[PDB]
Swiss-Prot record, chains A, B:
This is Caskin-2. Residues 2-65, 71-135 form the SAM domain. May not bind CASK. It is found in: Cytoplasm. The gene is CASKIN2.
Amino acid sequence: GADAQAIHNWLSEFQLEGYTAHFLQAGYDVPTISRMTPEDLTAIGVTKPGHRKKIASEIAQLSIAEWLPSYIPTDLLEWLCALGLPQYHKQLVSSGYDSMGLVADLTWEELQEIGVNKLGHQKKLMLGVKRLAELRRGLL
Amino acid sequence: GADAQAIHNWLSEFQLEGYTAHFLQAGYDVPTISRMTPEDLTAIGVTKPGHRKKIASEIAQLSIAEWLPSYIPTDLLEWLCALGLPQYHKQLVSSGYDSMGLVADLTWEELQEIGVNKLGHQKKLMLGVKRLAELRRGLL
């Protein structure tokens, strides 16, 4: 099972499961499927036009923002969402930490007056910051 | 429920659940707990020495590598693990994409001879690359 189950469910919603194995063999998972084109479907063997047409249409309705499967937060809100901390966004922005590049240099001391007061939230965040800086340094 | 359930389970393994609510109130989740000190426990109100001693000991046994809760891959293997693609690591390294900084400039064409052949795997990876570069540009 796993993403097999997720795909098979999705496909089942319109009786086109049975194509499940196609997506698996090609190493697709739901979030990636969401970004397929028709040519992509053709390429993985969805060749019958009736079905390709349908599945494509069904894919344009698909949800999934956006940093899945990759797990690379491009922007601050995304990042705070992964970390499960979105309630702090507006505080951060009011205090001038409004981008990835900027949060990367957030420091422990700014923590009050920004108003993250729960200590597990402080720790979670500061760990994220730490790793984030580490990752940037990782480019040079 | 959610991480409530995860914590409460963990704590239950040694009859110290009942402290669950402490961890919640402080906005702790399991991966963050794993990194607490004794002073951290004291600070969130685990004040009885018997229990602080025990919970600390139990925390040193805790698993959880490492990019959870943050979701910031410091290094290539981590990143490929989030993406669910670790089977491609050695191929990537044999081809000189052996760091984050370097994969950030991986391009679609190197894909064969590196030997990612499944097209959902190609797409997943190249999306990751794309977002990864985007994130770096995000620092300047």
